[PDB]
């Protein structure tokens, strides 16, 4: 998982 | 027909003070692009005695994204309707999930808040779930946002950290969508909060935010760093904004981006990022004149500079705590 | 120390008959491999006046899978913990979502049920969410399950519809997992229901199931085809089992698979699918002797053969109600 | 989406 996902 | 009465579940803090909760409560959702001042504004609201926001939940934006995948796909949409999974059912389920996370992941307060940046892409849908919620959309110069993403190597799905132009096009598309959601809801429900203005004029902008939310003024929002120091505001040591929000509101991040944008992108700025001019940021200015700082924030900025060693100690102790955890992850594997 | 009370939300319908609901209610979860008799057994329960199950929800197993992806990834698990998203929080949100779907996607009833096959991979977690729920795990000969999957072209992520051996190995792994979850919970919580035995002996097996669930016997469960005909059981026209469950319980699908498994897989059967013998299915037998059919189910089978033109009509009307939808889906293009 | 996901 990235720091954020759109 | 069949009606579904949902009476008030509630929270008991110490001294048995009751805190009921349901979909009609006046929630506060904060969002916008990552690296646009979203943690700052939620921490300033946490500093108010009546409001609790707390850390990013991560699961709320992820659930909202999965739900979009379902109802966007025509075949799956039809399978769901034929299974009885109407919008009314799915909304009841999604609202229940989201409300439980917001209520339980932090301490109780008269007004509850959530900040997860990309929830504002779903603001019109969240208004359908939570009819009395209000929304704060952070706005920040896209050049500052992308400079932050790239220099701090913030990972966001679909952002190429080697490419300023690509990241500014992504910023532009995200903000076009989020700003449109905000204006679809309108000013009774969604307030754009401009990062540079909030930093330059914190008392006037916090007054404006608190008025919009119908929360009385309290000078405590101008001392948030002290409440962090005594664990009165919850922070995640794994979020990337923690080492900046521990400081008083200050001027250091307004225009760090200037001179770090490749020249071809500076040339093409108005075409790459048309949302800049739409939102009030001159794409030909490096930087825009964001305005004149209040003396309060000039004084904060001077005092931080005087305590540079105290702050660098805290920023290193933070990376140290980040190190313990990346050990506890190579040990979890 | 914070206490979070959740008073009974409730359903009301005609005559304002109240149906309260919360996580402690005696829910029924049904599952197993797809193509193992799960729709049959949920429709036999729906035929009871006290129980409502309804159609597959799809969103419940999909949310369970997404939750597993979160908690199993060590980095993400640590980010959640440092955001305040403890198991207590996540469980409250998950249970609230799942409960709302179960309650709202169908008519109310004294006992609510859900059938989504792969929920039983998460039965131990569901017992944590819903401590008074009971579980039915369908068991069917893996050779019959895989024959059904391949012949009817049932799409399941990871199943290669051109490869019996690979599908049987997937079946074997899935059932090792689901059977283990069932036995972890133990016989007060989870009843394995054998498809071939339910078909051969429906009165005795439905007595066993209803006693396990603490629901009184009703002869209506032996007339489910009539209750479908007067819309007392909800069916999705898009689910692949609808055209079989509209018939009375019958013998036609016990051993259709025989002679359709490639020779080399028949020779290797005990090594390919060791779960067959573990569950009581002889891997050397083509077919095992599943037992002697009750005269009730022999008579149903004969009557279906007599009315084969009436049943062919309804099968066609289902395929045409399918094409109307597959037109409405390419219209969404 | 497939008919089922494990
Ligand atoms: N006390 C403070 N005063 C001014 N800006 C602050 C601040 N605390 C955080 N911010 C700014 O908020 C930005 C991060 O926003 P978000 O919380 O939406 O990720 C950071 O920008 P930089 O990375 O450009 O320094 C940071 O400097
Ligand atoms: N009335 C009935 N009598 C006997 N078996 C039935 C039945 N209705 C459904 N089934 C069987 O249930 C299986 C589907 O299981 P599920 O609902 O778990 O997908 C099908 O197997 P086949 O595909 O081998 O015919 C079907 O024949
Ligand atoms: Mg006031
Ligand atoms: Mg001033
Ligand atoms: Mg009998
Ligand atoms: Mg008999």
XYZ file of C-alpha atoms and ligand atoms in Angstrom:
736
model
C 0.000 0.000 0.000
C 1.162 3.532 -0.835
C 0.951 6.417 1.640
C -2.173 7.488 -0.338
C -4.462 6.145 -3.071
C -6.747 8.465 -5.099
C -43.298 -0.642 3.103
C -40.591 -1.581 5.615
C -39.025 1.132 7.817
C -35.691 0.790 9.641
C -35.596 2.765 12.901
C -31.971 3.338 13.970
C -32.027 4.851 17.488
C -28.971 6.596 18.868
C -26.006 4.469 19.751
C -23.824 6.473 22.121
C -20.403 6.992 23.702
C -19.638 7.207 27.426
C -16.430 8.987 28.302
C -15.413 9.397 31.940
C -18.090 10.709 34.333
C -20.766 8.916 32.236
C -21.188 11.924 29.910
C -23.305 10.535 27.058
C -22.335 11.039 23.390
C -25.029 9.698 21.020
C -24.248 9.095 17.354
C -26.145 8.459 14.108
C -26.028 9.451 10.434
C -27.669 12.788 11.060
C -24.974 14.093 13.371
C -23.052 17.207 12.306
C -19.810 15.507 11.224
C -16.874 17.441 9.764
C -14.954 15.951 6.808
C -11.601 17.558 5.883
C -9.764 16.712 2.700
C -8.005 17.868 -0.430
C -4.714 16.851 -2.045
C -2.140 15.266 0.247
C 0.555 17.891 1.112
C -1.933 20.811 1.050
C -2.164 21.607 4.774
C -4.819 19.000 5.642
C -3.052 17.810 8.801
C -2.440 21.391 9.935
C -6.098 22.323 9.652
C -7.344 19.172 11.352
C -4.828 19.710 14.208
C -6.014 23.313 14.623
C -9.601 21.988 14.943
C -8.446 19.276 17.359
C -7.047 22.094 19.453
C -10.624 23.325 19.946
C -12.209 21.780 23.079
C -15.444 20.947 21.254
C -13.969 19.131 18.212
C -11.981 15.904 17.817
C -10.531 14.804 14.473
C -7.563 12.531 15.199
C -5.302 10.620 12.794
C -5.938 9.524 9.188
C -8.036 6.384 9.203
C -6.865 5.022 5.778
C -9.810 2.560 5.738
C -12.445 5.190 5.004
C -10.928 6.318 1.654
C -10.177 2.721 0.809
C -13.780 1.634 1.394
C -15.046 4.566 -0.657
C -12.752 3.591 -3.512
C -13.867 -0.040 -3.460
C -17.519 1.043 -3.469
C -16.849 3.170 -6.565
C -15.357 0.123 -8.301
C -18.581 -1.814 -7.679
C -21.229 0.663 -8.816
C -19.080 1.913 -11.725
C -19.028 -1.501 -13.403
C -22.302 -2.139 -15.283
C -22.302 -5.921 -14.894
C -21.555 -5.753 -11.175
C -24.110 -2.955 -10.727
C -26.762 -5.250 -12.227
C -25.704 -8.245 -10.138
C -25.949 -6.112 -7.008
C -29.444 -4.822 -7.838
C -30.644 -8.393 -8.559
C -29.230 -9.408 -5.183
C -31.295 -6.763 -3.400
C -28.242 -4.475 -2.909
C -29.915 -1.204 -3.815
C -28.378 2.213 -3.271
C -30.451 2.444 -0.100
C -28.908 -0.787 1.239
C -25.353 0.017 0.197
C -25.649 3.543 1.649
C -26.858 2.179 4.986
C -23.895 -0.227 5.092
C -21.285 2.302 4.019
C -22.541 4.985 6.403
C -22.521 2.524 9.286
C -18.939 1.452 8.606
C -17.651 5.015 8.241
C -19.481 6.302 11.308
C -18.133 3.507 13.516
C -14.543 4.288 12.466
C -14.977 8.044 13.074
C -16.642 7.525 16.458
C -14.357 4.808 17.848
C -10.817 5.601 16.680
C -10.495 8.572 19.002
C -11.690 10.281 22.112
C -15.300 11.568 22.196
C -16.183 15.221 21.626
C -19.290 17.288 20.942
C -18.314 17.528 17.269
C -16.535 14.711 15.440
C -14.271 15.209 12.487
C -12.378 13.050 9.989
C -9.422 13.911 7.798
C -8.393 11.566 5.018
C -7.333 13.698 1.999
C -9.027 11.915 -0.887
C -12.424 11.583 0.813
C -13.214 14.978 -0.733
C -13.324 13.258 -4.139
C -16.477 11.629 -2.744
C -17.986 14.673 -1.022
C -21.322 14.597 -2.866
C -21.734 10.915 -1.927
C -20.743 11.567 1.684
C -23.387 14.313 1.823
C -25.960 11.686 0.744
C -24.819 9.448 3.633
C -24.442 12.192 6.217
C -26.905 14.980 5.399
C -25.795 17.373 8.147
C -22.045 16.897 7.638
C -19.948 19.855 6.513
C -16.784 19.699 4.416
C -13.500 21.634 4.466
C -11.584 21.427 1.189
C -7.922 22.461 1.559
C -6.532 24.453 -1.354
C -2.769 24.989 -1.811
C -0.683 26.189 -4.767
C -0.255 23.050 -6.874
C 3.438 23.873 -7.340
C 3.954 23.720 -3.583
C 1.923 20.504 -3.347
C 3.924 18.737 -6.082
C 7.257 20.030 -4.753
C 6.337 18.519 -1.385
C 5.264 15.192 -2.868
C 8.506 14.921 -4.874
C 11.059 16.227 -2.359
C 9.590 14.239 0.552
C 8.962 11.194 -1.681
C 5.329 10.833 -0.626
C 3.961 7.755 -2.364
C 0.589 8.262 -4.035
C -0.741 5.719 -6.495
C -0.182 7.008 -10.018
C 2.235 9.839 -9.136
C 5.645 9.529 -10.833
C 8.079 10.999 -8.319
C 10.721 11.539 -11.011
C 8.403 13.771 -13.092
C 7.195 17.270 -12.019
C 5.038 17.693 -15.130
C 3.213 14.415 -14.654
C 2.601 15.112 -10.968
C 1.244 18.600 -11.731
C -1.171 17.146 -14.301
C -2.354 14.649 -11.665
C -2.687 17.430 -9.088
C -4.658 19.461 -11.644
C -7.113 16.638 -12.398
C -7.599 15.810 -8.707
C -8.281 19.405 -7.762
C -10.650 19.949 -10.684
C -12.706 17.006 -9.416
C -12.524 17.964 -5.731
C -13.324 21.650 -6.343
C -16.297 20.620 -8.497
C -17.616 18.318 -5.737
C -17.254 21.170 -3.267
C -19.194 23.604 -5.454
C -21.886 21.026 -6.265
C -22.550 20.926 -2.526
C -22.367 24.723 -2.225
C -21.317 27.119 0.487
C -23.752 25.905 3.113
C -21.991 22.540 3.055
C -18.427 22.998 1.746
C -15.826 25.682 2.563
C -12.599 25.972 0.468
C -9.794 26.778 2.913
C -6.723 28.332 1.290
C -3.540 27.055 2.906
C -1.382 30.132 2.328
C -4.159 32.434 3.646
C -4.647 30.272 6.753
C -0.903 30.451 7.453
C -0.724 34.222 6.780
C -3.907 35.042 8.750
C -4.603 32.256 11.255
C -6.953 34.159 13.582
C -9.189 35.449 10.768
C -9.224 32.109 8.902
C -9.846 30.028 12.027
C -12.697 32.470 12.845
C -14.098 31.882 9.366
C -13.768 28.079 9.656
C -15.319 27.970 13.132
C -18.222 30.224 12.016
C -18.891 27.963 9.047
C -18.917 24.927 11.361
C -21.058 26.759 13.997
C -18.457 26.313 16.733
C -17.657 29.199 19.131
C -14.286 30.894 19.028
C -11.528 29.664 21.328
C -7.982 31.006 21.479
C -6.852 27.421 22.106
C -6.660 26.933 18.328
C -3.735 29.386 18.290
C -1.706 27.189 20.691
C -1.959 23.784 19.095
C 1.736 22.929 19.505
C 1.311 23.018 23.283
C -1.603 20.591 23.215
C 0.370 18.164 21.058
C 3.191 18.341 23.633
C 0.902 16.996 26.341
C -0.855 14.385 24.150
C -4.082 16.388 23.883
C -4.111 15.993 20.098
C -3.608 12.522 18.591
C -0.847 12.055 15.994
C 0.436 9.077 14.049
C 4.227 8.827 14.109
C 3.998 7.140 10.696
C 2.208 10.031 8.921
C 4.540 12.261 6.894
C 3.188 15.536 8.235
C 3.816 14.860 11.896
C 7.229 16.515 12.010
C 5.781 19.777 10.592
C 2.498 20.009 12.548
C 4.282 19.745 15.897
C 5.473 23.392 15.268
C 3.336 26.537 15.696
C 1.754 27.888 12.520
C 4.686 29.333 10.577
C 5.750 30.758 7.198
C 8.463 28.318 6.208
C 6.553 26.255 3.610
C 4.756 28.930 1.555
C 7.241 29.206 -1.305
C 10.006 26.601 -0.814
C 9.077 25.290 -4.241
C 10.331 28.420 -6.035
C 13.322 27.665 -8.282
C 12.887 23.862 -8.001
C 10.488 23.434 -10.928
C 12.166 22.460 -14.229
C 12.219 25.406 -16.668
C 10.065 23.724 -19.327
C 7.320 23.171 -16.733
C 7.598 26.765 -15.485
C 7.137 27.820 -19.130
C 4.123 25.545 -19.648
C 2.597 26.163 -16.200
C -0.673 27.673 -17.340
C -1.398 24.777 -19.716
C -0.115 22.016 -17.424
C -2.061 23.236 -14.371
C -5.028 25.432 -15.416
C -6.576 24.931 -11.935
C -3.880 27.350 -10.611
C -5.430 30.411 -12.210
C -8.961 29.061 -11.635
C -8.276 28.943 -7.884
C -6.497 32.345 -7.733
C -2.814 31.372 -8.124
C -1.037 33.193 -10.936
C 0.735 30.496 -13.024
C 3.198 33.153 -14.280
C 4.268 34.156 -10.749
C 7.205 32.380 -9.016
C 5.801 32.799 -6.422
C 2.480 34.629 -6.328
C 2.243 37.305 -3.677
C 0.182 35.242 -1.282
C -0.269 38.260 1.020
C 1.190 39.958 4.050
C 1.787 37.799 7.153
C 0.116 38.699 10.386
C 2.465 39.611 13.191
C 1.322 36.521 15.104
C 2.752 34.197 12.424
C 5.852 36.350 11.858
C 6.537 36.028 15.593
C 5.966 32.277 15.550
C 8.374 31.900 12.645
C 11.086 33.933 14.391
C 10.700 31.888 17.590
C 11.029 28.582 15.733
C 14.269 29.861 14.181
C 15.553 30.738 17.669
C 14.762 27.181 18.812
C 16.180 25.473 15.721
C 18.134 22.986 17.857
C 15.126 22.089 20.053
C 13.029 21.406 16.944
C 15.697 19.391 15.147
C 15.925 17.247 18.275
C 12.205 16.495 18.037
C 12.329 15.835 14.289
C 15.153 13.339 14.837
C 13.431 11.647 17.781
C 10.496 11.225 15.371
C 12.591 9.583 12.659
C 14.012 7.406 15.452
C 10.504 6.261 16.345
C 9.984 5.712 12.597
C 13.094 3.530 12.719
C 11.887 1.319 15.588
C 8.787 0.546 13.542
C 10.564 -0.264 10.284
C 12.528 -2.707 12.440
C 9.273 -4.184 13.813
C 8.256 -4.666 10.140
C 11.415 -6.409 8.944
C 10.878 -8.611 12.030
C 7.204 -9.164 11.123
C 8.681 -10.674 7.922
C -11.930 3.719 29.562
C -14.638 4.574 27.013
C -17.911 2.619 26.806
C -19.862 2.534 23.529
C -23.484 1.411 23.813
C -25.444 0.524 20.652
C -29.181 0.227 21.418
C -31.254 -1.995 19.143
C -31.897 -0.433 15.812
C -34.937 -2.228 14.448
C -37.087 -3.063 11.429
C -40.837 -2.463 11.229
C -43.254 -3.228 8.416
C -46.938 -4.040 8.028
C -48.721 -3.688 11.394
C -45.515 -2.009 12.710
C -44.126 -5.381 13.851
C -40.725 -4.551 15.346
C -37.584 -6.550 14.478
C -34.597 -5.342 16.544
C -31.057 -5.989 15.344
C -27.505 -5.715 16.762
C -24.280 -7.771 16.697
C -25.557 -10.228 19.331
C -28.468 -11.463 17.275
C -28.604 -15.168 16.298
C -27.607 -14.773 12.655
C -27.116 -17.772 10.307
C -24.206 -17.777 7.885
C -24.181 -20.360 5.061
C -21.277 -21.037 2.769
C -18.833 -23.498 1.254
C -17.421 -23.833 -2.220
C -19.532 -22.385 -5.015
C -21.462 -25.230 -6.762
C -21.799 -27.273 -3.527
C -25.534 -26.901 -2.828
C -25.336 -23.557 -0.996
C -28.276 -22.000 -2.837
C -30.395 -25.129 -2.306
C -29.816 -25.126 1.444
C -30.439 -21.371 1.819
C -33.659 -21.704 -0.233
C -34.840 -24.585 2.005
C -34.295 -22.289 4.990
C -36.061 -19.397 3.214
C -38.966 -21.815 2.850
C -39.326 -21.730 6.636
C -41.604 -18.899 7.835
C -39.203 -17.914 10.630
C -36.056 -17.558 8.492
C -35.074 -15.195 5.697
C -31.815 -15.569 3.790
C -32.303 -14.100 0.322
C -29.881 -13.637 -2.547
C -26.037 -13.527 -2.521
C -24.977 -10.069 -1.375
C -21.463 -10.184 -3.062
C -20.354 -7.141 -1.064
C -19.981 -9.089 2.199
C -17.273 -11.499 0.965
C -15.632 -8.680 -0.962
C -15.376 -6.526 2.198
C -14.059 -9.500 4.151
C -11.364 -10.002 1.520
C -10.371 -6.356 1.530
C -10.115 -6.410 5.325
C -7.797 -9.436 5.137
C -5.579 -7.558 2.679
C -5.247 -4.725 5.213
C -4.479 -6.669 8.395
C -2.221 -9.209 6.705
C 0.164 -6.640 5.251
C 2.623 -5.755 8.051
C 3.321 -2.165 6.974
C -0.391 -1.441 6.571
C -1.263 -3.105 9.904
C 1.238 -0.799 11.641
C -0.124 2.316 9.902
C -3.632 1.377 10.988
C -2.577 0.822 14.581
C -0.853 4.220 14.699
C -4.014 5.787 13.279
C -6.094 4.431 16.160
C -7.661 1.688 13.941
C -7.369 -1.148 16.448
C -9.056 -4.517 15.955
C -11.814 -3.224 18.281
C -12.437 -0.290 15.919
C -12.174 -2.283 12.672
C -14.422 -5.030 14.079
C -17.079 -2.495 15.015
C -17.037 -1.008 11.514
C -16.997 -4.365 9.718
C -19.807 -5.790 11.825
C -21.899 -2.680 11.313
C -21.492 -2.865 7.515
C -22.242 -6.573 7.291
C -25.242 -6.359 9.633
C -26.815 -3.480 7.673
C -26.541 -5.462 4.409
C -28.054 -8.609 5.969
C -30.907 -6.689 7.571
C -31.817 -4.374 4.715
C -31.452 -6.382 1.462
C -34.502 -8.571 2.190
C -37.769 -8.847 4.034
C -37.610 -9.002 7.845
C -37.967 -12.258 9.737
C -37.476 -13.648 13.248
C -34.136 -15.168 12.159
C -31.884 -13.609 9.529
C -29.526 -15.571 7.321
C -26.812 -14.841 4.752
C -25.407 -17.020 2.033
C -22.266 -15.994 0.180
C -20.089 -19.117 -0.374
C -16.637 -17.907 0.545
C -17.716 -16.172 3.787
C -17.001 -19.515 5.424
C -13.261 -18.910 4.795
C -13.725 -16.181 7.466
C -15.978 -18.069 9.876
C -13.688 -17.667 12.918
C -13.563 -13.895 12.288
C -17.306 -13.746 11.790
C -17.832 -15.494 15.141
C -15.731 -12.727 16.724
C -18.005 -10.109 15.098
C -21.292 -11.945 15.783
C -20.873 -14.165 18.835
C -24.346 -15.767 18.697
C -24.257 -16.525 14.946
C -24.304 -20.121 13.717
C -22.654 -21.449 10.565
C -23.626 -24.085 7.979
C -20.697 -25.359 5.874
C -21.867 -27.141 2.710
C -19.747 -30.158 1.748
C -20.008 -31.751 -1.718
C -17.806 -34.248 -3.551
C -15.025 -32.103 -5.052
C -15.335 -33.999 -8.338
C -18.974 -32.875 -8.610
C -18.077 -29.297 -7.610
C -15.288 -29.051 -10.188
C -17.375 -30.706 -12.906
C -20.070 -28.085 -12.257
C -17.600 -25.175 -12.296
C -16.060 -26.326 -15.608
C -19.213 -27.478 -17.424
C -21.297 -24.424 -16.488
C -18.269 -22.088 -16.931
C -18.590 -20.532 -13.491
C -15.960 -17.829 -13.222
C -14.013 -17.958 -9.957
C -10.833 -15.969 -9.520
C -7.917 -18.315 -9.972
C -9.834 -21.331 -11.367
C -8.654 -22.441 -14.809
C -11.780 -23.648 -16.590
C -9.724 -25.705 -19.070
C -7.929 -27.702 -16.315
C -9.736 -30.287 -14.111
C -6.562 -31.082 -12.171
C -5.850 -27.443 -11.333
C -9.453 -26.820 -10.335
C -9.485 -29.881 -8.074
C -6.294 -28.719 -6.390
C -7.928 -25.315 -5.798
C -11.048 -27.050 -4.459
C -8.848 -29.147 -2.166
C -7.049 -26.106 -0.721
C -10.275 -24.129 -0.260
C -12.029 -26.973 1.545
C -9.048 -27.694 3.789
C -9.324 -24.054 4.832
C -13.120 -23.909 5.275
C -13.325 -27.253 7.053
C -10.569 -26.145 9.457
C -12.448 -22.906 10.251
C -15.614 -24.880 10.921
C -13.861 -27.274 13.314
C -12.054 -24.419 15.078
C -15.489 -23.054 15.943
C -16.720 -26.514 16.890
C -20.106 -28.215 16.728
C -21.997 -25.744 18.892
C -21.305 -23.105 16.240
C -20.724 -24.788 12.856
C -22.586 -27.754 11.268
C -21.120 -29.419 8.147
C -23.991 -30.207 5.814
C -23.291 -32.880 3.197
C -24.946 -32.044 -0.124
C -25.447 -35.647 -1.246
C -26.923 -36.655 2.116
C -29.277 -33.631 2.165
C -30.492 -34.610 -1.325
C -30.856 -38.305 -0.473
C -32.503 -37.676 2.951
C -34.093 -34.226 3.030
C -36.533 -34.749 5.926
C -33.893 -36.130 8.280
C -31.241 -33.581 7.217
C -33.589 -30.623 7.436
C -34.616 -31.874 10.919
C -30.924 -31.900 11.891
C -30.273 -28.438 10.442
C -33.332 -26.812 12.009
C -32.567 -28.416 15.414
C -28.977 -27.136 15.233
C -30.265 -23.609 14.448
C -33.008 -23.852 17.171
C -35.812 -23.311 14.690
C -38.950 -25.521 15.012
C -39.726 -28.048 12.295
C -42.069 -26.904 9.515
C -43.155 -29.082 6.587
C -42.903 -25.937 4.371
C -39.167 -26.713 3.893
C -40.203 -29.783 1.845
C -42.264 -27.587 -0.511
C -39.800 -24.899 -1.470
C -40.648 -24.989 -5.198
C -44.185 -23.901 -4.355
C -43.037 -20.993 -2.236
C -40.762 -19.748 -5.010
C -43.830 -19.832 -7.290
C -45.680 -17.413 -4.998
C -42.701 -15.111 -4.361
C -41.999 -16.105 -0.774
C -38.344 -16.751 -1.580
C -36.146 -14.095 -3.196
C -34.025 -15.184 -6.164
C -31.542 -13.366 -8.375
C -32.143 -14.017 -12.065
C -28.390 -13.461 -12.566
C -27.180 -16.183 -10.131
C -26.144 -19.442 -11.850
C -28.090 -21.707 -9.478
C -31.506 -20.130 -9.936
C -32.570 -22.523 -12.718
C -31.805 -25.567 -10.510
C -33.260 -24.402 -7.193
C -36.669 -23.666 -8.726
C -37.133 -27.515 -8.873
C -38.049 -29.759 -5.936
C -35.113 -31.478 -4.276
C -34.006 -34.118 -6.770
C -31.288 -36.674 -7.629
C -30.082 -35.449 -11.028
C -26.830 -33.770 -9.939
C -25.321 -36.327 -7.534
C -23.028 -38.069 -9.977
C -23.252 -36.260 -13.361
C -19.473 -35.857 -13.127
C -18.788 -39.566 -13.517
C -16.946 -40.347 -16.771
C -16.181 -36.632 -17.400
C -12.915 -36.402 -15.443
C -9.793 -36.927 -17.593
C -8.332 -40.438 -17.153
C -5.044 -39.215 -15.725
C -6.827 -37.219 -13.028
C -9.021 -40.247 -12.136
C -5.853 -42.339 -11.760
C -4.266 -39.695 -9.489
C -7.443 -38.679 -7.628
C -6.330 -39.547 -4.064
C -3.143 -37.520 -4.499
C -4.774 -34.550 -6.301
C -7.577 -34.139 -3.721
C -6.701 -35.686 -0.341
C -9.642 -33.770 1.167
C -12.042 -36.221 -0.541
C -11.148 -39.089 1.771
C -10.822 -36.734 4.763
C -14.460 -35.717 4.248
C -15.663 -39.262 3.604
C -15.656 -39.373 -0.224
C -13.797 -42.408 -1.631
C -11.319 -41.042 -4.213
C -11.051 -44.499 -5.779
C -14.797 -44.701 -6.484
C -16.474 -43.325 -9.627
C -18.877 -42.598 -7.965
C -18.877 -43.427 -4.279
C -22.067 -45.014 -3.090
C -23.528 -41.875 -1.518
C -26.455 -43.842 -0.086
C -29.993 -44.880 -0.841
C -32.448 -42.166 -1.909
C -35.514 -41.589 0.133
C -38.717 -42.323 -1.733
C -39.669 -38.630 -1.366
C -36.685 -37.551 -3.499
C -37.068 -40.460 -5.971
C -40.673 -39.352 -6.529
C -39.652 -35.718 -6.959
C -37.111 -36.819 -9.549
C -39.659 -38.892 -11.466
C -42.184 -36.014 -11.433
C -39.640 -33.562 -12.820
C -38.969 -35.959 -15.660
C -42.709 -36.137 -16.370
C -43.107 -32.329 -16.418
C -39.912 -31.831 -18.410
C -41.604 -29.495 -20.922
C -42.954 -27.295 -18.139
C -39.443 -27.133 -16.606
C -37.843 -26.476 -20.001
C -40.158 -23.472 -20.404
C -39.098 -21.935 -17.090
C -35.435 -22.614 -17.884
C -35.911 -20.725 -21.156
C -37.790 -17.854 -19.509
C -34.801 -17.510 -17.156
C -32.296 -17.427 -20.028
C -34.419 -14.793 -21.769
C -34.722 -12.738 -18.572
C -30.910 -12.991 -18.618
C -30.543 -11.712 -22.180
C -32.779 -8.715 -21.484
C -30.200 -7.798 -18.833
C -27.157 -8.536 -21.007
C -28.737 -6.150 -23.526
C -29.170 -3.492 -20.815
C -25.442 -3.949 -20.021
C -24.134 -3.494 -23.567
C -26.510 -0.508 -23.631
C -24.413 0.895 -20.756
C -21.687 0.944 -23.444
C -15.693 -8.965 -11.611
C -15.936 -12.780 -11.624
C -19.011 -14.641 -10.374
C -16.953 -15.419 -7.217
C -13.712 -14.249 -5.604
C -11.960 -16.479 -3.056
N 2.824 24.375 11.656
C 2.725 24.466 10.337
N 2.811 25.675 9.775
C 2.758 25.782 8.443
N 2.561 24.802 7.542
C 2.457 23.610 8.135
C 2.490 23.362 9.494
N 2.322 22.014 9.761
C 2.188 21.473 8.567
N 2.230 22.382 7.526
C 2.423 22.106 6.123
O 1.490 21.145 5.680
C 2.071 20.457 4.532
C 1.592 19.022 4.549
O 0.183 18.952 4.274
P -0.684 17.617 4.502
O -0.843 17.537 5.957
O -1.946 17.890 3.697
O 0.222 16.440 3.985
C 3.588 20.533 4.679
O 4.106 21.246 3.529
P 5.634 21.034 2.995
O 5.779 19.554 2.729
O 5.651 21.862 1.719
O 6.546 21.515 4.129
C 3.786 21.361 5.960
O 4.950 22.176 5.991
N -33.523 -28.738 -6.359
C -32.275 -29.191 -6.308
N -32.060 -30.531 -6.080
C -30.810 -30.970 -6.054
N -29.674 -30.277 -6.256
C -29.918 -28.977 -6.477
C -31.152 -28.366 -6.480
N -31.036 -27.003 -6.729
C -29.733 -26.809 -6.825
N -28.987 -27.968 -6.684
C -27.580 -28.157 -7.012
O -26.784 -27.165 -6.399
C -25.608 -26.970 -7.231
C -25.194 -25.496 -7.215
O -24.687 -25.272 -5.906
P -24.438 -23.691 -5.445
O -25.766 -23.121 -5.211
O -23.577 -23.804 -4.192
O -23.761 -22.975 -6.640
C -25.952 -27.444 -8.638
O -25.129 -28.567 -9.018
P -24.779 -28.897 -10.556
O -24.174 -27.650 -11.142
O -23.811 -30.074 -10.455
O -26.110 -29.223 -11.249
C -27.427 -27.847 -8.523
O -27.876 -28.903 -9.375
Mg -17.980 33.055 17.721
Mg -1.133 41.476 12.205
Mg -38.051 -39.717 6.277
Mg -37.288 -43.654 2.441
